[PDB]
Amino acid sequence: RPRFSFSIAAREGKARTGTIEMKRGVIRTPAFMPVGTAATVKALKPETVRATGADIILGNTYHLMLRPGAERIAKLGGLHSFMGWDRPILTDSGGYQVMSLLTKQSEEGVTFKSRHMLSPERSIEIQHLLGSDIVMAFDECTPYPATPSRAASSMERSMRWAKRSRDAFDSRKEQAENAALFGIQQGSVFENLRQQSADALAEIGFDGYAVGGLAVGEGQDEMFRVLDFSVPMLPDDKPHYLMGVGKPDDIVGAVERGIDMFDCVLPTRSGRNGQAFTWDGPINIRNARFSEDLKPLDSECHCAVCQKWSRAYIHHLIRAGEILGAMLMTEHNIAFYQQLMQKIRDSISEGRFSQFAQDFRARYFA
Amino acid sequence: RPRFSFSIAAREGKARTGTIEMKRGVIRTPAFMPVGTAATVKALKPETVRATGADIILGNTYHLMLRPGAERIAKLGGLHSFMGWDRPILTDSGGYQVMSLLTKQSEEGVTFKSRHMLSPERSIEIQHLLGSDIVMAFDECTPYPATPSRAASSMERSMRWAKRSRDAFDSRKEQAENAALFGIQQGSVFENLRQQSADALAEIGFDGYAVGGLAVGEGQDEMFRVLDFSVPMLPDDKPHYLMGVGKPDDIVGAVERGIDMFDCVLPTRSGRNGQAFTWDGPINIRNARFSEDLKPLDSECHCAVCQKWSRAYIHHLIRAGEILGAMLMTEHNIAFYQQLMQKIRDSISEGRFSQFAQDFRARYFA
Ligand SMILES: [Zn+2]
Ligand SMILES: [Zn+2]
């Protein structure tokens, strides 16, 4: 396999399906990436993550630099060996934490409170030390809402940081030869700024392009409105990654608008909170109505949890605070997401994705 | 397979090795039973529990009657179906909670504070509703220390309760035909009382005999002293079960004294707390000295955890409070216990158990 090759096998409207080939494996698109923030996808062995259908998982520069440390992970042989996942890993750059989990910001980078520093150069270096396959440029996720002036200033800094990220990545031969680098579009909800950002990123040139600055409280209508004009600005022949999205309905609509890659903590995090995804919409397994329900979480789901255990049992586990409850909920939810992505890929391949989206929504929101 | 058949294949001194055949499976003895208090062995799928080598697991009447409820479990098809473990299950009777997790005690039984009641009849009924394979008599675990007078009074009540347990079990045809009933010897640390208890239990007649009233703070020397005279009082041709024991060294010494069955929360509970068992003694994986240790938890252990992950990774997981840390620690510890039991069984079968015990101790306590 090559360092990086994205091939589009089929299209329907703005939707695409295909593959990213990388050294550590093939990624089927549209793709959902389970989030593995602390060098683990919560409550799952890597083999279980793979069994659900995942081709790639997400790590974070910010969290790993704090614990257990980037240099430490490198000394131990890199993130893949450390956690036991041998397939591709995408790492976020820390740019979301620049306004999240305080800080001192400047043109040079960001200092976080022990004191830690991130900059385009340090972020790219950390991602190298982790041995990330898809490296994200170091950016700033503009807060929402933002005024046009502030959104512009923020976006402009991010584009300068994108160029610095590109140069840092390229100067490190082992990284440049074995990993890929994605740029991140900013510009808040403003079409002109999104266009300027896209132009700057395409001029620099990246292996893939993320739509940043969304899933920050704007709501689905606004997010879709921004995607409507933003995705066509990105190079057509490279993957489009919508950061932090999202709920199943968000994913379907984003694919309709040309997005190829997704990640979110929702299936893992909300799973441990009792929320299970089903084709008839989400349920909260903690609800008393499930206490004697012998049916599986979802009637059609092919996952191992739905083959073996009842709603009643999982209800008991989650209510009791049992670790097995988190394990089963998470495996089901991630498997559900992967089944959704598979149905999306198949329907685009067969030229019936529009019908699938309609059918999905009718049942999910019944 | 029969309802119950215990066969002794080989002996060395007081130690025995053999099998218990029951309808749901064969139990190799000496046996370690992982504890599954809330209808789950903590942090493990039943398939993983089986993969470690476990033939049987333990549930508790007290905990399950409170949550999710005994009648509820029966309505849902019984404990085996509920939790997805199809092999034998032994259930404790609630007698330890009679002084543990307040209460109002009388000759009739015990009322626990919502208000719940246990008696020999109700305990046996609950165990029936759960569908337990090995039912424990309802007893009272005498507190330690106890005066001879109080130990005698307590033991005498337990023997009356043992007869009531026998009659309740026998009056329920489906239970009598498909499950087994074990009596529990009491008498604190007093030889004459232990003898009276053994005589009473043998007169009633049970499928197996537990040594109760130990692992209650007495310490290993005293526990071994009591076992020295107590185990030979029990019928030789039936299994001997030491309730609540214990650490690896406790198990080895108890087998040397004629015990066939063990359970304890130690490998599961202490696993989540960071303690890992090794042939060179226990370690606490939280310790900073393990932060960059690439070796597995134990150098010889055949478990899946030791095949795949480093001390360094597990150290990180436990320090970070990650669920996968609990999963990996628990799987290793239970697998370690099962490997210990296998080495015990093989060594007795080969007439070299005395040498094994000596070799085990020399290395474990080096
Ligand atoms: Zn499922
Ligand atoms: Zn191991």
Show the domains of chain B with their CATH numbers: 1-366 (3.20.20.105)
Structure tokens of B249? 């060294």
Tell me which residue has tokens 């910010």: A62
- CB atoms A323 and B43 under 8 Å: yes
- Listed as own residue / partner, the contacts of B268-271 with beta carbons closer than 8 Å and 24 or more positions apart are B268/B34, B268/B35, B268/B41, B268/B42, B268/B43, B268/B330, B268/B333, B268/B334, B269/B42, B270/B333, B271/B326, B271/B329, B271/B330, B271/B332, B271/B333, B271/B334
State whether residue A313 sits within 8 Å of chain B by CB.
yes
List residues forming the annotated binding site of A for Zn(2+). 301, 303, 306, 332
Residue reference for tokens 């252990």: B301
Cα-based angle B348, B258, B331 (whole degrees, multiple of 5): 70
Question: A192 CB contacts (<8 Å, ≥6 apart)?
Answer: none
Q: How far apart are CA A132 and CA A174, in angstroms?
A: 12
Residue A39 forms contact with B (CB below 8 Å):
yes
Contact across the interface for A84 and B312, Cβ inside 8 Å: no
Tell me the torsion sign for CA atoms A331, A337, A339, A342.
negative
Q: Respond yes or no: is residue A260 known to be catalytic.
A: no
Query: How many Å lie between the centroid of ligand 2 and the Cα of residue B279?
Result: 11
Residue closest to B124 by CA, chosen among B172, B69, B159: B172
A301 is written with which tokens?
């789901």
Q: Are B326 and B272 contacting, i.e. CB atoms less than 8 angstroms apart? A: yes
Question: How would DSSP label each residue in B7-23?
Answer: EEEEEETTEEEEEEEET
Q: For residues A121 and B330, what is the distance between their CA atoms, to the nearest angstrom? A: 41
Contact A183, A206 (CB under 8 A): yes
Spatial separation of the C-alpha atoms in residues B49 and A125, rounded to whole Å: 42
φ/ψ of B229, rounded to 5, equals: -95, -20
Q: How far is B242 from chain A (nearest CA, A)?
A: 27
B289/B274 Cα distance (integer angstroms): 13
The SS3 of residue A56 is: coil
d(CA A15, CA A351): 10
Is B94 marked as a binding-site residue? yes
Read off the DSSP letter of residue A352.
-
DSSP A137: P
Helices vs. strands in chain A: H and E counts, helices first = 15, 16
Q: Which chain B positions have a beta carbon within 8 Å of A316's beta carbon?
A: 38-39, 67-68
Nearest to B238 by CA among B290, B188, B202: B202
Beta-sheet strands, E only, within chain B: 5-12, 15-22, 25-29, 31-33, 57-60, 89-92, 103-105, 110-112, 116-118, 134-136, 180-185, 208-211, 240-242, 261-263, 275-276, 283-284
Cβ neighbour number for residue A224 with a 10 Å cutoff: 16
Rounded distance, CA B190 to CA B207, Å? 24
Contact between A328 and A318 under an 8 Å Cβ cutoff? The reply is: no
Residues 6+ apart with CB under 8 A from A205: A166
What one-character-per-residue DSSP string does A266-310 give?
A: HHHHHHHTTEE--TT--EETTSGGGTT--S-SSSS--SHHHHH--
- Determine if the peptide bond prior to A120 is cis (ω within 30°): no
Catalytic residue check, B298:
no
Question: Counting one residue from A and one from B, how many pairs have CB atoms under 8 Å apart?
Answer: 90
Residue A359 CA to chain centroid, in angstroms?
25
Rounded Cα–Cα distance for residues B265 and B288 (Å): 26
Breaks (C-N over 2.5 A) in chain B follow: 101, 113
For residue B58, what are its two tokens?
């333990």
Q: CA-CA distances (angstroms) from residue B272 to A295, B318, B330, B333?
A: 31, 8, 7, 10
Cβ burial of A102 (10 Å; 0-12, 13-18, 19+) is: exposed
Residues of A in contact with B310 (CB under 8 A): 76, 82
How far is the centre of ligand 2, averaged over its atoms, from the C-alpha of B306 (Å)?
Answer: 4
Instruction: Quickly list DSSP for A202-249.
Output: HHH--SEEEE-S-SSS--HHHHHHHHHHHGGGS-TTS-EEETT--SHH
Q: How remote is the CA of residue B9 from the centroid of ligand 2, in Å?
A: 29
| Lookup result for tokens 């107590």 | B230
- Is the separation of the CB atoms in B29 and B16 below 8 Å? yes
Buried b (16+ CB within 10 A) or exposed e, B156-183: bbbbebbbbbbebbeeeeebbebbbbbb
The CB density around residue B355, as the number of other CB atoms within 10 Å, is 12
Q: Exposed e or buried b for every residue in A310-320, given b needs 16+ CB within 10 A? A: bbbbbbbbbbb
CA nearest to B336, candidates B261, B294, B293, B280 = B280
Residue A255 in contact with residue A18, Cβ under 8 Å? no
List CB contacts of A172: < 8 A, sequence separation 6 or more.
A124, A125, A128
How far, CA to CA in Å, does B362 sit from each of B200, B281, B282, B336?
A: 40, 10, 14, 18
* Set B92, B207, B260, B298: catalytic member: B92
CA dihedral A202, A150, A145, A65 (to 10 degrees): 70
| Cross-strand bridge partners of residue A214 | none
